[PDB]
């Protein structure tokens, strides 16, 4: 799932 500040 799109996670902030992790590529």
């Amino acid at each position, epitope marked *: *799932e*799109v*996670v*902030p*500040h*992790k*590529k």
Partner: antibody
Amino acid sequence: EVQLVESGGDLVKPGGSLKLSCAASGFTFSRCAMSWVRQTPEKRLEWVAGISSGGSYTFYPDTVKGRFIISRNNARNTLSLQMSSLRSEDTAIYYCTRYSSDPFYFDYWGQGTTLTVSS
Amino acid sequence: DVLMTQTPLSLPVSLGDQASISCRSNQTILLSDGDTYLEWYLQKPGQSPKLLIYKVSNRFSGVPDRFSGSGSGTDFTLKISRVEAEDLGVYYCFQGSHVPPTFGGGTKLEIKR
């Protein structure tokens, strides 16, 4: 085209609690991480909560940790911020912000809601 | 945290000149995949902040080719060349490379006259 519109800031007292909200429209909210950035009355910008596309992951700065909860209804596309034990330092324009596809910077920002914390 | 100092605090410039605002981090913004995430945002008079330059040189769509960004590692810089009056506002530089993502102090670009 992306629109993020927020509502909720009212005069709160210290010790209080409020819950601000933000509506998104114009893009598939569920694939975009989202964030709430705030502008202090001295104009310096502080980031206060950030959230993953599914609501699983939640990140907070040390100053709001414990007192602010962020969450998101990925079905009636709203993103929120429930605010507990407020202090006067928390006065500011709260901005609902949309994280990039490449999630380390924000590309669109809401219009803002002033929260005032005072007695 | 990672302090982002920004200089100068207010910058008088006259329509047709060049303005350099510049920003600096006490820690590197370079992640091991070679991406340096320093972005530049614009808060015009009345409105909310816009992305102008993102990931050090790239320009978000819609920003004139007079906003150009350069720098690497720890000193970064914006060049507004041929300043026009509808450029007045406060310029903030930012870093998403480390959590928490910090922001610089702000630079008021003032139109000289």
